[PDB]
Enzyme design. Structure first.
Site, mmCIF file in Angstrom:
data_model
loop_
_atom_site.group_PDB
_atom_site.id
_atom_site.type_symbol
_atom_site.label_atom_id
_atom_site.label_comp_id
_atom_site.label_asym_id
_atom_site.label_seq_id
_atom_site.Cartn_x
_atom_site.Cartn_y
_atom_site.Cartn_z
ATOM 1 N N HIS B 202 45.183 87.417 -12.738
ATOM 2 C CA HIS B 202 43.522 86.396 -11.585
ATOM 3 C C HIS B 202 42.715 86.044 -12.418
ATOM 4 N N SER B 206 48.429 81.497 -10.322
ATOM 5 C CA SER B 206 49.630 81.693 -10.951
ATOM 6 C C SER B 206 49.997 80.201 -11.080
ATOM 7 N N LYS B 228 53.983 82.988 4.241
ATOM 8 C CA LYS B 228 54.959 82.834 3.907
ATOM 9 C C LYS B 228 55.382 84.398 3.388
ATOM 10 N N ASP B 229 54.613 84.943 2.502
ATOM 11 C CA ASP B 229 55.193 86.389 2.498
ATOM 12 C C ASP B 229 55.816 87.262 3.666
ATOM 13 N N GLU B 272 74.197 103.336 -13.761
ATOM 14 C CA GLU B 272 74.104 102.519 -11.682
ATOM 15 C C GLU B 272 74.128 101.094 -11.899
HETATM 16 C C1 HEC Z 1 58.724 112.076 -5.228
HETATM 17 C C2 HEC Z 1 58.181 110.814 -5.266
HETATM 18 C C3 HEC Z 1 59.306 109.529 -6.074
HETATM 19 C C4 HEC Z 1 59.168 108.424 -6.533
HETATM 20 C C5 HEC Z 1 57.714 107.825 -6.763
HETATM 21 C C6 HEC Z 1 59.956 107.277 -6.655
HETATM 22 N N1 HEC Z 1 62.167 108.310 -6.793
HETATM 23 FE FE1 HEC Z 1 63.084 107.430 -7.142
HETATM 24 N N2 HEC Z 1 64.027 109.228 -6.147
HETATM 25 C C7 HEC Z 1 62.905 110.518 -5.804
HETATM 26 C C8 HEC Z 1 63.900 111.816 -6.047
HETATM 27 C C9 HEC Z 1 63.761 113.210 -4.738
HETATM 28 C C10 HEC Z 1 65.155 111.398 -5.749
HETATM 29 C C11 HEC Z 1 66.685 112.313 -6.058
HETATM 30 C C12 HEC Z 1 67.051 112.592 -4.370
HETATM 31 C C13 HEC Z 1 68.009 110.924 -4.120
HETATM 32 O O1 HEC Z 1 68.301 110.642 -5.301
HETATM 33 O O2 HEC Z 1 67.652 111.280 -2.871
HETATM 34 C C14 HEC Z 1 64.742 110.031 -6.559
HETATM 35 C C15 HEC Z 1 65.734 109.527 -6.768
HETATM 36 C C16 HEC Z 1 66.330 107.948 -7.241
HETATM 37 C C17 HEC Z 1 67.247 107.448 -7.832
HETATM 38 C C18 HEC Z 1 68.660 107.424 -7.410
HETATM 39 C C19 HEC Z 1 69.083 107.719 -6.127
HETATM 40 C C20 HEC Z 1 70.772 108.309 -5.870
HETATM 41 O O3 HEC Z 1 70.552 109.137 -5.276
HETATM 42 O O4 HEC Z 1 71.389 107.966 -6.584
HETATM 43 C C21 HEC Z 1 66.769 106.494 -8.285
HETATM 44 C C22 HEC Z 1 68.124 105.096 -9.044
HETATM 45 C C23 HEC Z 1 65.490 106.092 -7.693
HETATM 46 N N3 HEC Z 1 64.797 106.986 -7.693
HETATM 47 C C24 HEC Z 1 64.547 104.991 -8.427
HETATM 48 C C25 HEC Z 1 63.848 105.212 -8.218
HETATM 49 C C26 HEC Z 1 62.411 104.079 -8.267
HETATM 50 C C27 HEC Z 1 62.903 103.009 -8.503
HETATM 51 C C28 HEC Z 1 60.948 104.339 -7.833
HETATM 52 C C29 HEC Z 1 59.851 103.597 -8.216
HETATM 53 C C30 HEC Z 1 59.228 102.433 -9.105
HETATM 54 C C31 HEC Z 1 61.335 105.556 -7.546
HETATM 55 N N4 HEC Z 1 62.859 105.883 -7.358
HETATM 56 C C32 HEC Z 1 59.917 106.678 -6.720
HETATM 57 C C33 HEC Z 1 61.944 110.431 -5.709
HETATM 58 C C34 HEC Z 1 60.885 109.686 -6.112
HETATM 59 C C1 HEC Z 2 58.517 90.767 -16.685
HETATM 60 C C2 HEC Z 2 58.182 89.764 -16.529
HETATM 61 C C3 HEC Z 2 57.714 90.648 -15.258
HETATM 62 C C4 HEC Z 2 57.662 92.016 -14.856
HETATM 63 C C5 HEC Z 2 58.544 92.631 -14.912
HETATM 64 C C6 HEC Z 2 57.077 91.947 -13.299
HETATM 65 N N1 HEC Z 2 55.710 90.725 -12.989
HETATM 66 FE FE1 HEC Z 2 54.883 89.992 -11.595
HETATM 67 N N2 HEC Z 2 54.731 88.554 -12.498
HETATM 68 C C7 HEC Z 2 55.127 88.504 -13.784
HETATM 69 C C8 HEC Z 2 54.315 86.173 -14.091
HETATM 70 C C9 HEC Z 2 54.552 85.838 -15.730
HETATM 71 C C10 HEC Z 2 53.518 86.499 -13.590
HETATM 72 C C11 HEC Z 2 53.000 85.312 -12.864
HETATM 73 C C12 HEC Z 2 53.900 83.904 -13.625
HETATM 74 C C13 HEC Z 2 53.723 82.582 -12.626
HETATM 75 O O1 HEC Z 2 52.767 82.875 -11.664
HETATM 76 O O2 HEC Z 2 54.286 81.666 -13.159
HETATM 77 C C14 HEC Z 2 53.969 87.021 -12.045
HETATM 78 C C15 HEC Z 2 53.259 87.369 -10.819
HETATM 79 C C16 HEC Z 2 53.696 88.704 -10.233
HETATM 80 C C17 HEC Z 2 52.292 87.953 -8.771
HETATM 81 C C18 HEC Z 2 51.599 87.396 -8.146
HETATM 82 C C19 HEC Z 2 52.462 86.845 -7.685
HETATM 83 C C20 HEC Z 2 53.673 85.774 -8.232
HETATM 84 O O3 HEC Z 2 55.065 85.750 -7.857
HETATM 85 O O4 HEC Z 2 53.343 85.093 -9.652
HETATM 86 C C21 HEC Z 2 51.837 89.913 -8.455
HETATM 87 C C22 HEC Z 2 52.113 90.030 -7.088
HETATM 88 C C23 HEC Z 2 53.339 90.286 -9.338
HETATM 89 N N3 HEC Z 2 53.338 89.131 -10.496
HETATM 90 C C24 HEC Z 2 54.038 92.024 -9.369
HETATM 91 C C25 HEC Z 2 54.814 92.437 -9.835
HETATM 92 C C26 HEC Z 2 54.737 93.792 -9.518
HETATM 93 C C27 HEC Z 2 54.593 93.923 -8.570
HETATM 94 C C28 HEC Z 2 56.094 93.890 -10.471
HETATM 95 C C29 HEC Z 2 56.511 95.412 -10.527
HETATM 96 C C30 HEC Z 2 56.516 96.514 -9.996
HETATM 97 C C31 HEC Z 2 55.755 92.905 -11.410
HETATM 98 N N4 HEC Z 2 55.165 91.909 -11.120
HETATM 99 C C32 HEC Z 2 56.840 92.962 -12.590
HETATM 100 C C33 HEC Z 2 55.740 88.934 -14.471
HETATM 101 C C34 HEC Z 2 56.197 89.759 -13.953
HETATM 102 C C1 LIG Z 3 48.720 86.835 -6.729
HETATM 103 O O1 LIG Z 3 48.279 87.322 -5.315
HETATM 104 C C2 LIG Z 3 48.714 88.455 -4.775
HETATM 105 C C3 LIG Z 3 47.977 89.871 -4.942
HETATM 106 O O2 LIG Z 3 46.447 89.553 -4.773
HETATM 107 C C4 LIG Z 3 48.590 91.000 -4.620
HETATM 108 C C5 LIG Z 3 47.090 92.057 -4.434
HETATM 109 C C6 LIG Z 3 49.347 90.418 -3.662
HETATM 110 C C7 LIG Z 3 49.212 92.060 -3.014
HETATM 111 C C8 LIG Z 3 50.668 92.984 -4.703
HETATM 112 C C9 LIG Z 3 50.905 94.602 -4.582
HETATM 113 C C10 LIG Z 3 50.118 95.253 -2.694
HETATM 114 C C11 LIG Z 3 51.248 95.693 -5.433
HETATM 115 C C12 LIG Z 3 50.206 96.289 -5.452
HETATM 116 C C13 LIG Z 3 50.826 97.587 -5.477
HETATM 117 C C14 LIG Z 3 50.573 99.020 -4.748
HETATM 118 C C15 LIG Z 3 49.471 98.588 -6.323
HETATM 119 C C16 LIG Z 3 51.097 100.360 -4.548
HETATM 120 C C17 LIG Z 3 50.074 101.278 -4.231
HETATM 121 C C18 LIG Z 3 51.086 102.082 -3.886
HETATM 122 C C19 LIG Z 3 50.603 103.604 -3.556
HETATM 123 C C20 LIG Z 3 49.221 103.405 -4.726
HETATM 124 C C21 LIG Z 3 51.211 104.413 -2.835
HETATM 125 C C22 LIG Z 3 51.109 104.692 -1.481
HETATM 126 C C23 LIG Z 3 50.325 105.587 -1.112
HETATM 127 C C24 LIG Z 3 50.213 105.933 0.413
HETATM 128 C C25 LIG Z 3 50.165 105.176 0.868
HETATM 129 C C26 LIG Z 3 49.423 107.584 0.066
HETATM 130 C C27 LIG Z 3 50.106 108.507 1.491
HETATM 131 C C28 LIG Z 3 51.093 108.883 1.623
HETATM 132 C C29 LIG Z 3 51.122 109.564 2.537
HETATM 133 C C30 LIG Z 3 52.982 110.130 1.848
HETATM 134 C C31 LIG Z 3 50.316 110.516 3.119
HETATM 135 C C32 LIG Z 3 51.585 111.839 4.040
HETATM 136 C C33 LIG Z 3 50.631 113.169 4.387
HETATM 137 C C34 LIG Z 3 50.766 113.543 5.275
HETATM 138 C C35 LIG Z 3 50.175 114.872 5.458
HETATM 139 C C36 LIG Z 3 50.638 112.383 6.882
HETATM 140 C C37 LIG Z 3 50.315 90.003 -3.800
HETATM 141 O O3 LIG Z 3 51.032 90.211 -2.993
HETATM 142 C C38 LIG Z 3 49.858 88.961 -4.437
HETATM 143 O O4 LIG Z 3 50.416 88.135 -3.994
HETATM 144 C C39 LIG Z 3 50.945 87.362 -2.284
#
Ligand code: HEC
Ligand code: HEC
Ligand SMILES: COc1c(O)c(C)c(C/C=C(\C)CC/C=C(\C)CC/C=C(\C)CC/C=C(\C)CC/C=C(/C)CCC=C(C)C)c(O)c1OC
Ligand SMILES: CCCCCCCCCCC(=O)OC[C@H](COP(=O)(O)OC[C@H](O)COP(=O)(O)OC[C@@H](COC(=O)CC)OC(=O)CCC)OC(=O)CCCCCCCC
Ligand SMILES: CCCCCCCCCCCCCCCCCC(=O)OC[C@H](COP(=O)(O)OCCN)OC(=O)CCCCCCCCCCCCC
Ligand SMILES: CCCCCCCCCCCCCCCCCC(=O)OC[C@H](COP(=O)(O)OCCN)OC(=O)CCCCCCCCCCCCC
Ligand code: HEC
Ligand code: HEC
Ligand code: HEC
Ligand SMILES: COc1c(O)c(C)c(C/C=C(\C)CC/C=C(\C)CC/C=C(/C)CC/C=C(\C)CC/C=C(\C)CCC=C(C)C)c(O)c1OC
Ligand SMILES: CCCCCCCCCCCCCCC(=O)O[C@H](COC(=O)CCCCCCCCCCCC)COP(=O)(O)O
Ligand SMILES: CCCCCCCCCCCCCCC(=O)O[C@H](COC(=O)CCCCCCCCCCCC)COP(=O)(O)O
Ligand SMILES: CCCCCCCCCCCCCCCCCC(=O)O[C@H](COC(=O)CCCCCC)COP(=O)(O)OCCN
Ligand SMILES: CCCCCCCCCCCCCCCCCC(=O)O[C@H](COC(=O)CCCCCC)COP(=O)(O)OCCN
Lengths: 93, 385, 126, 248, 72, 51, 385
Positions: B202, B206, B228-229, B272
């Site tokens: 920011h 972009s 668009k998103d 994987e």
């Molecule tokens: C509790 C919070 C939780 C978060 C947050 C989470 N996972 Fe997982 N994930 C799990 C659990 C529990 C398992 C094992 C159960 C299963 O595999 O179904 C798992 C399993 C996995 C597996 C193996 C799945 C399979 O069955 O082979 C992968 C790959 C994975 N996670 C990737 C990710 C990635 C990538 C993210 C986020 C960036 C993420 N997980 C976030 C809970 C989480």
């Molecule tokens: C290794 C490279 C790379 C990774 C991995 C990456 N980003 Fe980016 N991201 C960028 C770059 C570079 C830009 C800006 C590129 C441009 O605008 O020309 C960007 C831009 C963005 C934007 C603005 C919209 C856009 O497409 O430019 C968002 C939202 C964003 N990233 C979120 C994420 C999130 C969420 C993840 C995963 C958690 C992620 N990024 C992982 C490099 C990365």
């Molecule tokens: C460049 O311009 C932008 C831009 O500025 C942004 C912000 C975004 C948006 C990007 C994002 C929002 C990515 C950021 C992602 C996060 C910050 C992840 C946040 C997620 C969490 C913190 C986890 C979510 C947690 C909950 C919802 C808590 C509730 C969950 C549970 C399980 C409670 C349930 C329990 C009971 C008892 C009901 C764009 O896409 C984008 O391009 C247009």
């Protein structure tokens, strides 16, 4: 809040581009505009233009690496067969 | 002023997703960021609602996963969304990093953004590996064993580091319990790094697919890039719904439904699908220590990228040879994945070594030489003397 | 990060040699019209990235009318790339109009920054 | 590896539950359970399948209850701490024939028979692999293969040498519905039953997949319309430029 | 001291150090028997050899070994 | 009358380097603090009179 | 400018903990915020390193806690820090909210800050309750039972809500597993609410113990309040080290070392020490539904506080009667805790009802009437006519 450094994007009003003059815009409301009037003839001819200018840069690396993978896989399944087992003996040692 | 501008909380929502000035020429490749955000929210919400039924003992892990898939209402939806969404998370992240390499978003003034992106990439690989070991199948157990022995390659210290990681002498109950705790923990670090990523984005806005400035014709975020998103969000959910409901176990490996047996080694131990290029890079080096160093250098060589792109125009849009060698690189990365999926057999060793060399040569030799030649060619094409 | 003095030195060494010019100037303008920045209505000095302070200086140096023309070419390029079309053949930038107009401003800013750095790191004639 | 260590490729049999709309054949699941109980269950556990999952799928309520009450499970002990048994109920699991691993390896020449709850989902090829494994034993191994004694040959197993016996012969079971119970019929029935045991959600998974794909395809086309609608002011925007008076 | 506490809490616990060693009986294993055990999370082959197997072991030439090593 | 520079001067590098050796020394003292209690380093770490 | 001002990441560190203009007259009561931040970091780090050894089954919870206290190296340090630090977390939070009520930090323009504080307080009570139920002792099991039956008091819906919470028909294995998942989850929501709290603070700066502006004499954060907070950090660690190492089980209840038995009810079911005023408020009402409504209204009546303080000077520093009735309120809150620790016996029921009435009367009747009288008394003391 504190000041920050010089960025290359400002905000609405002081965005930071060059000063511009005598360049006029013209846009019509989308309620009086028909959307997707340019899908037919467009998705044929413009899509063929976008494919023709842009396919060969993708098709030559895919061709090179797919031919190289296919030749390597064919040589694998040759030398782990009965016909090439002495060649497997001499290249594995 | 307006309430979305004067409130403390809504000013961030405003300046990020409502009135953010976006360049009006960006195509659908500038949508993978929003798509990664949506897929991260999917992973976290399914992880919580599936970790309410998961017991992380080594004698109760696989049985609890099958308890989720059988006894929990709609639990098959949760696990299949979770695993296949992790696969789509890495696929959209690979497409996002390829958008970064192609259009030159790594260049100045966006080096901080690129470095925080590489940090997010490393943390995501760590999260996926830990969660794949939490299943405790056959592939989970033996992959954890191979990766930690790779950490035992470190000289004079490494064996004690590995006995620290294992919490014992092999992959046992403390290993799976701490992998579940770390795997619950590291996605919140990923969320914090994503917020830092959005800040570093920011402060300059972009890029655009032309490589020129976009300060002249900006259009807001709201309704334009919101809808668009929304288009690509619905397409992503459609393809995810296909690979969850109609063919869920395609991307996984069928050995992961065998319970974890420390005595039986599998016929082919393979991670994987997305860690296979890195596994091929590591397997191509005939040394353990140099293999681990080369595997981490294959990600740090993305950090050395903005200092080698000597092209004076931003992005590969209007350059011929850089675009060609970019697609050479992309199909080379696919060939690394396919070499890694195979066995250690003739001629896959020699092809793995050549493919690793072309990977590092693209990041270190091909980009600066081709960018210098393209600069001089642009100059002498139009300057007459 | 090419430092325009260096690319100008290499390009002038190619142009002043007859053999190298006769060899790789047809390759050069073939590369130019396969690049296709003309077809969006741009010039190559409109295409140099301008987010470093030396190029920002060379854009402050520029006269007014060329600055307004450059602003129009950028906005028509963004609009044409947005519609995913190309400009019609009458509106393409021709070969004679692709003039290196911003190159001398860039080169004098290069020489100024180079001279400032050299004089900032001088010894003394003892 | 050669093709011998990798095993022969199981072909594409046209099952009645392939395709994105076809469900299981529940009569085939019922007959597959009968062939399971009378052939496999001497030597294969089914540890992850409870009795209650068969109610309404392949058998009725009283049929599952009167099949579960033939077995004995561990009750809670009596008022003197003596261990006692009880007949089964709907909430218990299908018991294996062997009390532990060492009895299995003792009764099967060292080889451990794998639990068949997930065996069609834990092998590459799946249904085709299990069917070709069962109906793939030659009458005699090909010339030049020295089998270790106590092992058997079929080309679909990875390595060629399997420790299973050919246990599907003509009409060793009788079907309740009068279907001719040849070897291939019984193998098709048990492979369908094991597909049910690994994937009990299969029917509901495909119908919820139908609902989700229909709703998301409609949402995707509607969102394409709304994106082309709200961008119509920006796609059609035009710019003309008359260069300004240079005196200023 | 804080770093020592929070890092040494992740090392091998007491009970997994308790099962670090196995104490198999020499007098209980017969001569012509192989014993396969799970020790330290790893398989271990145990054999009581005959002196003719000793003579067979220490009299094979080292050039028939890609990693030559004596029996002792 | 030039100098060897890359935005950092060779004169500046030789001006800071007799301090950078002391920085390396203080970092090694820091590792010697934070790495005792680790029994692999105690093959080296107790020699003179901490035993 | 400086690098701490021009960098994107270090500008937040600058504008929050380095160059933040603080009023130069604030005493040690403006240090509980930094102390709560330190104690939250303590709770999270001990929670991770102790949840690497915790198995959340109902048959394996108490045995795994004792496995931590016996077999894990320095595990007694982890559990004792964790439980006693949760006790200190609520004690410092009670002192922080009392600083808020006393010096009038709830008043305008800091109503958003006060509301985010009340949200943090509710989430912290939820986190402590879930983590106390994760022990699965006697008090843990029966406290979970009593609180969820209190949720069953809701008309026409409540029984199905409670069968949803339990995941069954009583407090069983799914209940303890989902309490562990939620208990791992909610502290990160608390961290996000803390960041929102710091934003709503930073848009107007801290108050001062005089109730006048502090825009005239500001001193920076760095070295001044850094070392003042370092003083109270070392005092807090000293008192925490006393109650961890020399007397760890004082604040806890000894029945929590009996394993969870659903058949044996205890002789006196009492929560941990800080939830006792709220338990007394709920126990004082002779109805289940009105009891639950009164228990939540005892926290929402902190939200109705800035609209009833009709005093025209900020804070109770220079006012007599408001200061006196403030200490009436504080010792009433202590008396609520001590009533709740006792049995349902004569005369503790009548005293619990009177004490609940004086709680709500302080928040709804005493503050506006005493503030109005104090305003008129300040006016006629100095204006002559
Ligand atoms: C509790 C919070 C939780 C978060 C947050 C989470 N996972 Fe997982 N994930 C799990 C659990 C529990 C398992 C094992 C159960 C299963 O595999 O179904 C798992 C399993 C996995 C597996 C193996 C799945 C399979 O069955 O082979 C992968 C790959 C994975 N996670 C990737 C990710 C990635 C990538 C993210 C986020 C960036 C993420 N997980 C976030 C809970 C989480
Ligand atoms: C290794 C490279 C790379 C990774 C991995 C990456 N980003 Fe980016 N991201 C960028 C770059 C570079 C830009 C800006 C590129 C441009 O605008 O020309 C960007 C831009 C963005 C934007 C603005 C919209 C856009 O497409 O430019 C968002 C939202 C964003 N990233 C979120 C994420 C999130 C969420 C993840 C995963 C958690 C992620 N990024 C992982 C490099 C990365
Ligand atoms: C460049 O311009 C932008 C831009 O500025 C942004 C912000 C975004 C948006 C990007 C994002 C929002 C990515 C950021 C992602 C996060 C910050 C992840 C946040 C997620 C969490 C913190 C986890 C979510 C947690 C909950 C919802 C808590 C509730 C969950 C549970 C399980 C409670 C349930 C329990 C009971 C008892 C009901 C764009 O896409 C984008 O391009 C247009
Ligand atoms: C694999 C699992 C990934 C899961 C992620 C799910 C999302 C997939 C994203 C794929 C993608 O983003 O590619 C974008 C690519 C470039 O887009 P562009 O801006 O240059 O084209 C402008 C468009 O005409 C404007 O036209 P318009 O904007 O009006 O509609 C666009 C289109 C929406 O389609 C897509 O988003 C991609 C399929 O609406 C339709 O008419 C669809 C008709 C059925 O679109 C293309 O035009 C295709 C070019 C080749 C790309 C091949 C990709 C192979 C990897
Ligand atoms: C460790 C670091 C991570 C590295 C990641 C490695 C790559 C991961 C693979 C992800 C696939 C992403 C493909 C590349 C994405 C960027 C491509 C792109 O930018 O598309 C635009 C490109 C040219 O379009 P222009 O912008 O130049 O048009 C201007 C008009 N004058 O248009 C095109 O040229 C056509 C684009 C077609 C894409 C083909 C994708 C091939 C995918 C692999 C297939 C594997 C099966 C063989
Ligand atoms: C659900 C809502 C939660 C509500 C929480 C209710 C309170 C819970 C218990 C928390 C106790 C914390 C009390 C702290 C009181 C606020 C701090 C304070 O007011 O101290 C300053 C006060 C007067 O100082 P001045 O600022 O007026 O100085 C004038 C200079 N000319 O100085 C003083 O008047 C003396 C300060 C003495 C502090 C003694 C603490 C007493 C603690 C009671 C414990 C009882 C155990 C038996
Ligand atoms: C994993 C992360 C984790 C976090 C974060 C965490 N805890 Fe806990 N907490 C636990 C575990 C595990 C237990 C159960 C083991 C135990 O009680 O020793 C627990 C138990 C507790 C207990 C009961 C202690 C006992 O033995 O009676 C309390 C009280 C508590 N937590 C409060 C908190 C508070 C307050 C916070 C933060 C605001 C917090 N916890 C954050 C893991 C965590
Ligand atoms: C003679 C006892 C015996 C009977 C009866 C028997 N099996 Fe087996 N089966 C085995 C053994 C032993 C193995 C283990 C093979 C091995 O490990 O090499 C086995 C393995 C299998 C495997 C896995 C083979 C592999 O390579 O993974 C399948 C599938 C299988 N049996 C199906 C069945 C089915 C279906 C039935 C019922 C028709 C059945 N078996 C009845 C002994 C038996
Ligand atoms: C509901 C009341 C309330 C709660 C609960 C609360 N805060 Fe505050 N906090 C305040 C108020 C009010 C202020 C402003 C102090 C004033 O009046 O000037 C404040 C200020 C702060 C400050 C600035 C330093 C200071 O002493 O003012 C920090 C830091 C802070 N809070 C952190 C926290 C943290 C951390 C938590 C719990 C995680 C928390 N607060 C919970 C009301 C609360
Ligand atoms: C009004 O003036 C102010 C003021 O403006 C500010 C800002 C503060 C300061 C406020 C704070 C310091 C509170 C800040 C608190 C947070 C930001 C909460 C964040 C807490 C966390 C615990 C961050 C989360 C980090 C982790 C969970 C990482 C832990 C991971 C571990 C231990 C992994 C271990 C595993 C392995 C393998 C090593 C004041 O104190 C103050 O008064 C003087
Ligand atoms: C944190 C997770 C990030 C996920 C990335 C998602 C990016 C796209 C978000 C789309 C939000 C749409 C809001 C538009 C809007 O309110 O416009 C409002 C009104 O528009 C609408 O009513 C849109 C119709 C309803 C669409 C509902 C879509 C819900 C499905 C979301 C699936 C992803 C969560 C303002 O529109 P106007 O300014 O043109 O008048
Ligand atoms: C996220 C966790 C929040 C916890 C709240 C902690 C609030 C107090 C933090 C204290 C930091 C002290 C840094 C001062 C400093 O660098 O001044 C530096 C140098 O000062 C020092 O060297 C202080 C001596 C070393 C003290 C080390 C204390 C470590 C114990 C910390 C325990 C809590 C983590 C600048 O000082 P100067 O500007 O006056 O020259
Ligand atoms: C994951 C987040 C990480 C940290 C990033 C921070 C970004 C947070 C985005 C939150 C967006 C939604 C917040 C909407 C709240 C706006 C309401 C509001 O500001 O009204 C506020 C009052 O707010 C409250 O009382 C409750 C706020 C709790 C918010 C908990 C979510 C009105 O206050 P006002 O701005 O008019 O100031 C006048 C002073 N008397
Ligand atoms: C929800 C919010 C959670 C908390 C996030 C906000 C608070 C973040 C505080 C972070 C404090 C530590 C960051 C200091 C690092 C400064 C280095 C730097 O900014 O140099 C950056 C490069 O940074 C990187 O490459 C990776 C930084 C990743 C940070 C990972 C923690 C260069 O920045 P700059 O463009 O100003 O330099 C121009 C050269 N003269």
């Amino acid at each position: 809040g504190p000041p920050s450094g010089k960025t290359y994007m400002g905000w609405w009003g002081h965005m930071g581009g060059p000063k511009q003059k005598g360049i006029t815009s013209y846009a019509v409301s989308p309620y009086a505009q028909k959307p997707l009037q340019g899908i037919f003839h467009n998705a044929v001819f413009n899509s063929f233009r976008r494919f023709k200018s842009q396919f060969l840069y993708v098709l030559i690396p895919a061709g090179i690496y797919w031919y190289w993978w296919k030749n390597g896989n064919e040589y694998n399944e040759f030398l782990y067969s009965k016909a090439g087992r002495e060649e497997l003996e001499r290249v594995n040692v | 002023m307006a309430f979305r501008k004067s409130n403390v909380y809504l000013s961030l929502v405003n300046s990020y997703i409502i009135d953010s000035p976006q360049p009006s020429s960006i195509n659908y490749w500038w949508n993978m960021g929003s798509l990664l955000g949506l897929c991260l929210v999917i992973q976290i919400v399914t992880g919580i609602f599936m970790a309410m039924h998961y017991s992380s003992n080594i004698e109760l892990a696989f049985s609890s996963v099958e308890h989720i898939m059988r006894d929990v209402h709609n639990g098959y939806i949760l696990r299949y969304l979770h695993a296949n969404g992790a696969s789509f998370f890495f696929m959209v992240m690979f497409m996002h990093m390829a958008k970064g390499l192609y259009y030159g978003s790594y260049r100045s003034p966006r080096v901080t953004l690129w470095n925080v992106g590489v940090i997010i990439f490393i943390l995501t690989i760590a999260t996926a590996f830990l969660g794949y070991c939490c299943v405790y199948g056959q592939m989970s157990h033996w992959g954890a064993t191979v990766i930690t022995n790779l950490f035992s390659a470190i000289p004079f210290v490494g064996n004690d580091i590995v006995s620290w990681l294992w919490g014992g002498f092999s992959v046992s109950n403390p290993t799976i319990q701490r992998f579940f705790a770390l795997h619950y923990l590291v996605p919140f670090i990923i969320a914090a790094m994503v917020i830092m990523h959005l800040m570093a984005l920011h402060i300059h806005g972009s890029s655009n697919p032309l490589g020129i400035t976009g300060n002249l014709d900006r259009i807001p975020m709201h309704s334009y890039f919101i809808f668009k998103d929304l288009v690509t969000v619905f397409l992503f959910m459609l393809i995810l719904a296909l690979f969850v409901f109609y063919s869920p176990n395609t991307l996984g490996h069928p050995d992961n439904y065998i319970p974890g047996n420390p005595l039986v080694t599998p016929a082919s131990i393979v991670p994987e699908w997305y860690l296979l290029p890195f596994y091929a890079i590591l397997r191509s080096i005939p040394d353990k220590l140099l293999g681990v160093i080369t595997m981490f250098a294959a990600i740090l060589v993305l950090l050395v990228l903005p200092f080698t792109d000597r092209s004076v125009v931003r992005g590969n849009t209007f350059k011929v040879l850089s675009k060609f060698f970019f697609f050479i690189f992309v199909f080379n990365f696919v060939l690394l994945g396919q070499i890694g999926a195979c066995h250690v057999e003739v001629p896959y060793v020699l092809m793995g070594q050549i493919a690793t060399f072309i990977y590092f040569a693209y990041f270190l030799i091909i980009v600066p030489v081709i960018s210098t030649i393209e600069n001089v060619l642009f100059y002498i094409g139009r300057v007459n003397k | 990060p090419q430092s325009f003095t260096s690319i100008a030195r290499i390009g002038d060494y190619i142009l002043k040699s007859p053999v190298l010019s006769k060899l790789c100037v047809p390759v050069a303008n073939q590369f130019i019209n396969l690049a296709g920045y003309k077809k969006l209505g741009l010039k190559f000095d409109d295409l140099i990235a301008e987010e470093n302070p030396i190029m920002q200086t060379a854009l402050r140096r520029l006269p007014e009318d060329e600055s307004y023309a450059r602003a129009y070419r950028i906005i028509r390029a963004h609009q044409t790339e947005l519609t995913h079309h190309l400009l019609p053949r009458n509106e393409w930038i021709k070969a004679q109009e692709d003039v290196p107009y911003l190159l001398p401003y860039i080169l004098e800013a290069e020489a100024a920054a180079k001279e400032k750095d050299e004089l900032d790191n001088i010894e003394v004639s003892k | 590896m050669t093709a011998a260590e990798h095993g022969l490729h199981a072909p594409a049999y046209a099952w009645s539950h392939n395709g994105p709309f076809e469900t299981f054949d529940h009569a085939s699941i019922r007959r597959g359970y009968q062939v399971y109980r009378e052939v496999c269950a001497a030597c294969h556990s089914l540890d992850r399948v409870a009795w209650r999952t068969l109610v309404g799928v392949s058998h009725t309520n009283e049929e599952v209850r009167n099949m579960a009450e033939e077995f004995e499970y561990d009750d809670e002990p009596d008022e003197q701490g003596n261990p006692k048994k009880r007949p089964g109920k709907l909430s218990d699991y299908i018991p294996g024939p062997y009390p532990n691993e060492q009895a299995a390896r003792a009764a099967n020449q060292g080889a451990l028979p794998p639990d068949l709850s997930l065996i069609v989902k834990a092998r590459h090829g799946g249904c085709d692999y299990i069917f070709s494994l069962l109906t793939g034993y030659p009458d005699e191994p090909p010339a030049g293969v020295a089998l270790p004694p106590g092992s058997n040959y079929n080309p679909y197993f990875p390595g060629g040498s399997i420790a299973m016996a050919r246990v599907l012969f003509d009409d060793m079971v009788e079907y309740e519905d009068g279907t001719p119970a040849t070897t291939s019929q019984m193998a098709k029935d048990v492979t369908t039953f094991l597909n049910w045991c690994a994937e009990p959600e299969h029917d509901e998974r495909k119908r919820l997949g139908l609902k989700t794909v229909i709703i998301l395809s409609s949402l995707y086309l509607l969102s394409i319309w709304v994106k082309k609608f709200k961008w119509a002011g920006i796609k059609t925007r035009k710019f003309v430029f008359n260069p300004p008076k240079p005196r200023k | 001291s804080t770093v020592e506490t929070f890092i040494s809490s992740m090392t091998a616990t007491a009970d997994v150090l308790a099962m670090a060693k196995v104490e198999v009986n020499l007098a209980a294993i017969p001569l012509g028997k192989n014993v396969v055990v799970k020790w330290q999370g790893k398989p271990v082959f145990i054999r009581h050899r005959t002196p003719h197997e000793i003579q067979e072991a220490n009299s094979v030439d080292m050039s028939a070994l890609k990693d030559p090593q004596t029996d002792a | 009358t030039g100098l060897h520079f890359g935005r950092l001067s060779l004169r500046s590098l030789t001006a800071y380097a007799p301090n950078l050796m002391l920085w390396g020394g203080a970092s090694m003292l820091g590792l010697f603090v934070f790495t005792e209690g680790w029994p692999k380093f105690q093959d080296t770490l107790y020699k003179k009179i901490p035993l």
